[PDB]
Design a protein around this ligand. Sequence first.
Ligand SMILES: Nc1ncnc2c1ncn2[C@@H]1O[C@H](COP(=O)(O)OP(=O)(O)O)[C@@H](O)[C@H]1O
Ligand SMILES: Nc1ncnc2c1ncn2[C@@H]1O[C@H](COP(=O)(O)OP(=O)(O)O)[C@@H](O)[C@H]1O
Ligand SMILES: Nc1ncnc2c1ncn2[C@@H]1O[C@H](COP(=O)(O)OP(=O)(O)O)[C@@H](O)[C@H]1O
Ligand SMILES: [Mg+2]
Lengths: 469, 472, 15, 188, 45, 503, 120
Amino acid sequence: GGATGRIVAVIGAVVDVQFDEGLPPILNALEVQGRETRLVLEVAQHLGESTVRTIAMDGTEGLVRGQKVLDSGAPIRIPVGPETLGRIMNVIGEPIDERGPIKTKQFAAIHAEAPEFVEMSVEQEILVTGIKVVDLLAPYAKGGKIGLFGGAGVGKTVLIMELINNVAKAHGGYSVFAGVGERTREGNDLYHEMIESGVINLKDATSKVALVYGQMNEPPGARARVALTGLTVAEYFRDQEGQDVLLFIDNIFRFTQAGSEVSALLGRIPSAVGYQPTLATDMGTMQERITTTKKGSITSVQAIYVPADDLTDPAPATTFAHLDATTVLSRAIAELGIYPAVDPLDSTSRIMDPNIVGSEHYDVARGVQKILQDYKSLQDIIAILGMDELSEEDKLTVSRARKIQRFLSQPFQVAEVFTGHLGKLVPLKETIKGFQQILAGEFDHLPEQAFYMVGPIEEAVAKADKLAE
Amino acid sequence: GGATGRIVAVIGAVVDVQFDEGLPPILNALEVQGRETRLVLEVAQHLGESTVRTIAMDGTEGLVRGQKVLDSGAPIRIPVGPETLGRIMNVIGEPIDERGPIKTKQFAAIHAEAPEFVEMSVEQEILVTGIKVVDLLAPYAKGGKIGLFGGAGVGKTVLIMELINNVAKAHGGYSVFAGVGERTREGNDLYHEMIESGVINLKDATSKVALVYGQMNEPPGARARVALTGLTVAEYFRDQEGQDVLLFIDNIFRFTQAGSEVSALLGRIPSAVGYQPTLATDMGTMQERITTTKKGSITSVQAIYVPADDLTDPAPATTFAHLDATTVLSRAIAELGIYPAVDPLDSTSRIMDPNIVGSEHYDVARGVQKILQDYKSLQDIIAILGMDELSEEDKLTVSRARKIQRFLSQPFQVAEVFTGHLGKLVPLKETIKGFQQILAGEFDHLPEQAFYMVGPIEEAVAKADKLAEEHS
Amino acid sequence: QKLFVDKIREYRTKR
Amino acid sequence: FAKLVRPPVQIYGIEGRYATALYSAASKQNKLEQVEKELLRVGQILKEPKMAASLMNPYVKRSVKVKSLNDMTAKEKFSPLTSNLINLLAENGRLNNTPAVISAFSTMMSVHRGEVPCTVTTASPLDEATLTELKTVLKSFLSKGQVLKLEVKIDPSIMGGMIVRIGEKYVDMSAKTKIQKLSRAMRE
Amino acid sequence: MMRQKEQEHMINWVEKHVVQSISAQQEKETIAKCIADLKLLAKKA
Amino acid sequence: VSSILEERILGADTSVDLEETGRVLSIGDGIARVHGLRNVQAEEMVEFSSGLKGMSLNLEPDNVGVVVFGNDKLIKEGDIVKRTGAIVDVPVGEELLGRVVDALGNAIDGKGPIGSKARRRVGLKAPGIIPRISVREPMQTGIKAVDSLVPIGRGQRELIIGDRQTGKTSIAIDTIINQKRFNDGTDEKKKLYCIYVAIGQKRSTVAQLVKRLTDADAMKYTIVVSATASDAAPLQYLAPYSGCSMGEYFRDNGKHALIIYDDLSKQAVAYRQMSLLLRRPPGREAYPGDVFYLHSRLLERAAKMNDAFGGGSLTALPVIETQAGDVSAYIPTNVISITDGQIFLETELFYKGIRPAINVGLSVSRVGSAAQTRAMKQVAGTMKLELAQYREVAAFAQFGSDLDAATQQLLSRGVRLTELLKQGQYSPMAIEEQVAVIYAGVRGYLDKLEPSKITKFENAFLSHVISQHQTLLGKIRTDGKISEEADAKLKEIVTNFLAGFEA
Amino acid sequence: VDLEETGRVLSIGDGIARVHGLRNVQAEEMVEFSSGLKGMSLNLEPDNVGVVVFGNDKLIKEGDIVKRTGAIVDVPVGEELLGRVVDALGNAIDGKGPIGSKARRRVGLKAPGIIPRISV
Ligand SMILES: Nc1ncnc2c1ncn2[C@@H]1O[C@H](COP(=O)(O)OP(=O)(O)O)[C@@H](O)[C@H]1O
Ligand SMILES: Nc1ncnc2c1ncn2[C@@H]1O[C@H](COP(=O)(O)OP(=O)(O)O)[C@@H](O)[C@H]1O
Ligand SMILES: Nc1ncnc2c1ncn2[C@@H]1O[C@H](COP(=O)(O)OP(=O)(O)O)[C@@H](O)[C@H]1O
Ligand SMILES: [Mg+2]
């Protein structure tokens, strides 16, 4: 099986290897020797005289024309078990936390089919994360593809820190982080914060998050397939562990960037805006592998970059097509000053139905969305003449909607250094009561800054008493 | 000496010449024989065996396949020296004014290397060109590259003729005009203007400006090598004579566009908007040779066409990168009636620095730009609503801004046929004093019609008094 | 040591 | 597919592809020098002006080209390797490329003999004792069991001389490049 | 600048004189040293 | 003369050796298809016989695309190309300080040869998650706006993005000129070795830049690396990797270093020229695929090192221009995506009057208050929140929507802090004067004081505090936090100076 | 017959007739198709000549015999073209009889230099 071949042409990832004795099928792993490290190749197309066109994951500074590769029968196999929890591995399967090897028994192959239609689960139960704008305007699903979009500087990483904290500590099962082209210091702060919070235990096997981290400066074969490594680890924690597992993939747009870079170099015609033609198919495979099945329950929060706040880029549009409950993280509401600058007027939910969550929660959510959507056209009425001629009731609903929009902001516990405020936790019933109490007309007299950075409605009462007297 | 090879493929400039024994290096000048006029080709790429891919500079008509070509073995050696002042030449070195051949002693090659970093002049004396908008907002650098951006019919050529008729009188240094891809009408008018103005002299050896013309009737290989011609003439007059030369190159987008046409024929992959991949470095070498050095001074005013008024086009963008004083001779300010329609916001100069131009000039210039930026925001509000929505502060800013924006305009000497006014040469201190008075707001009673095509501020006071008296 | 000793000799002659 | 028999020098391009196919076939059926001498005879044939004028010209109706080359094969009784080779080159229309595939397969067979294409520039017309001792030390210098095929060229420009390229390895004691190395040394 | 331009004049005259002499120098110890060098690379190869 | 003789005749070995070569096919436009190098390794420095290097990329079975380091006239078809034997490398030392070095190692400034000792491979792999530790030190720039809204960390990358002619290179040189007072001081942790990689600029701009740095006495932190316009496209391509390798040398020795990548879009366009000449398929705006991988390597070569790995930091700040402010173009989206800190200049504030022209809410520093001093953190968070409030209330009340006392308070404090953040060119100030002046602006005492009079307030206030309050500023900068006695003392001094300002 | 002065259309496609041989041709030359049509020989290549036609491609087959004229692209000219509708090549399409042109002006010469010009 271990058939040897010859590197004959080298451009980045895109490396042509000539086999004449044993030809590996597509999506495989070739071990290039001659390097002081190992080099791995993801085999793709076979062009002739048998030629695999592989994508090379480490930097190809120094590959000789005519080198010897070894061929194994692996799509790519990684160490996977309960041993790989407190340890950071990268896409080839190897630890980059400098703690020796990973001593496991069984491995796992990175490439598999999305399971079957008959194994798709059907239950939908609400997940409450403690965030206000999540809990009433786009609630999450235990067993659903949660996605949070945003540009650059809108607050996706601080939001994913708050979800990791506030959910991975409120979880008896396991966790899997996947840093897919995330910058190295933010993942380093993640690893040190995980150690100091205790979800990673460096002394024994009492950890419950498994970290797979491919840096943002790796060749595109190592920056596309590292998301699939996170999928494989979290599938094993869902397939035959028998455990509720959650996977945090930050930031699946490096996946599509990596695919567009190799498709520039592989010899495929550029599609629409400049990405690969196989965008929807490749991301359909790697987003339909990650879903809850009848064997186990897996919930996937995905931090998903959009380029310069352009939601009509085809890769965020197809990513919208794959989710269950998205959350837009705009920038304009942070130019206002609300953090994270969350758009719920562009956010979705499969979970938000009057039988699933309730009628009270649904009606206060649609009331908040109705009064914030009306505030836009009413604000454009304001923008020419001012607050003079609207009406009694029109100025009243403008001030009420502005008060709600200031009440959507919530101090994160992980972001007590950006604003200085300590940060609070808000249950679901308190969010329902607070927004129903602002819509009910109780707080028409308090100023807009009394509701700005608060938790419950009692915190808004206390801040109004502090500002007044 | 030379090597006889064979033309085997012909597209314009791009002529693939077969050499089997004597293939010459890149950037060579090799003449096609059997022709009426000498058909100098320029060797680039050797592509196969034998295959020099030459660019052909003249009439490609009649180039039979398999035609004998004599390789001379040098880059394009042209005449230089003091024997080229008052004498027109084109890119081969040939005199095209029908006075006779060049009687100079030495030849300089068209292709050269830039002056190194080791010896570069870093001093900046202010060039005051008698124009109010220039000397106020983007004053020129005596010894730096100056660029006149703008579209079609925006007044670039008229501004160049003002710059010759104003600055070229001052520099005793030998000037060099290079026309690249412009009207032959303008080169003709410029040649007779240089005769009549005494700047050249057809009966003596004491002329002052050399002329190179590669006008827009020429095939693209020719227009891709005119700036190199006039530039190595002016580079002779810098290095081996030590003079303070002026270099008036109109219109460097024709150089870049001829490069794009040739490269579309050269089989290179098209870059962005439709240009060549070598837009940064071909123009890079050509602009780095246009530099003031320790051995002498170049003050190079160059007009740079923009295609369809796009400043985001790659050739104007890299030319913004390669300059020391830009001037965005816009069109919309000529729709408003101001000539030249120099956008002064997007025009800057490297020399504007309070440790150079003084504190008074800097404060007046930045106040003028502040008032015009506030006027741009307020003209958004005015264009929607109207001027009856502004406060007293906003209306005094709008009124001072329209007064300043009319007072930037002046009549030039060369454009006296279009307007009625004579040529106004405004000194520097009168520009500072006039804009300082209008900015400080001592003229809140004169009409804005009194600042149009004026010059000095006393002419504005006199125009307002004459307007009131003719209404009296 | 063929060429550079001849160059040494010419360094002497220019010296 | 079938196991394509590896040629010693990978000549690339179209003509190298035809030549590697022909080499693998002739090495399966083990008649390599026979196919080489037959391709040399073909390359002698297709330089005749009547045959090459009939072949390079279009509007001689490709079926008639295939018929003419099959009749020329059946007249001079080629082996069943080069018969199907000339028929395949006629069917694909790359009869323009047949002297280049003959050159490429001749190169592959000359490496199959073991020759090394040695290049030497003495930069002066050298004598026979120099050539004898040079071939002696160079035959000792190359490898075991391989035969060299050397060529010499001259030019008065490069002073001194004796550059030797043997099998990509290029030893260079030319006086000009010695002055160039001392030139990079002296400018610093 | 004195030592710089004298250095440039010196180095260019040295190179020109080297071209002038070694362009007209042949006595076959060049070729003898070269075949000795091929012999030395043979012994070490 | 005689020393020149002996160094010429002893330095060159003339040690001839059998060596891999290959003849040259098409030498097109700086690219050369070379036939023969069957043992060349990918991206290797190789050498054309006229004495000029090239870099072997795009290894194909036909031929190797070597792209030349310089002029193209000096190469014919059919000449040899010798393998040097190693990856392209940069000679790095601390004797390379204060000397303009052409992009490989070749110091083209007329001050003798470089006394290098430590050769370094230029395409090295950046450190992983364990050798890095987070930002800790406050990388100060001397700009009030940068150090009070978007502060830099020693350990960090932070863009300077704008449009052309806005003040981005001037911000970079303010950042350079600030750090003189930390070099000539005492702590090694404060000291600065910076590398200014000028990509694709003109030689006279680099010459006047060296003039400004020499006149400001900057030439001991600084290492200027010029790959100008006349240099070849691989010299412009490879120059910021060279500056990164020099910064990595200082970082892995344990000295706090930085690199300013001036005009990083010129590297992007030079690599576009290289790919389109080596016949790679074009992607978007004719830039190829891996431009993000290019800048991603280049910019993730920098973060703070572990305390067991010397403790040296690197601060990458690349300067990037857009065209017509289009942030959505390919290179700005890629280079915003790789970096985290980014300083946005819109230009309408440059013509409106604030200098340096940070137009602001687009600009963000993700490390935030962690990269400030304790005093600036205690003062300037409410300033950022107030500027956010001011911007949004002025944006909807452009016409006078509703003016209570709160809205005129917001516009008053916002306009006054806007004129606080104005600062002249090439005048960086230390952190303690910034804490003093933003204390005088945010903590009252300036809210009703006629916004045209803020600049004379700045000048007379800095003159006052540098006149008889030097030891108190020493207390502020050495104690870290601004103490409560120093707080009430600053209150008293700003009140006394408000009297002397209305005197 | 002769590949020196005549040639055969290899592939007329969208607007280009790639004609084989035609060795005596020169660049930018009016070369006429035996369909009665004209064209101008543009880019010369070592295998073929790219002649762009002066009419529709419908009238031209493959292998239709192409013949050189012997002169660069011209148009008939003179005062005998006054009063008259001509085609772009010079043929009178007004139907009132042929033209009486004697001279023959080349269609692609250069504009005059800056000296034979004088201003308006
Ligand atoms: N709850 C919050 N409170 C204050 N600031 C926040 C909050 N959430 C996000 N931010 C801001 O978001 C920025 C971090 O952005 P980041 O998430 O790293 O970018 P991206 O969204 O592209 O991943 C910081 O400047 C921080 O101030
Ligand atoms: N000072 C001026 N006064 C009046 N008209 C002017 C002035 N400057 C330029 N123009 C107008 O601009 C035109 C000249 O533009 P020009 O520079 O020749 O176009 P191009 O930029 O294509 O060369 C003239 O028609 C003239 O009407
Ligand atoms: N703080 C400042 N005060 C005054 N002028 C400034 C300041 N900062 C920048 N400038 C202006 O910015 C210009 C330089 O811009 P620069 O940084 O060179 O942009 P680019 O590098 O894109 O050309 C100078 O003309 C200078 O007047
Ligand atoms: Mg700059």
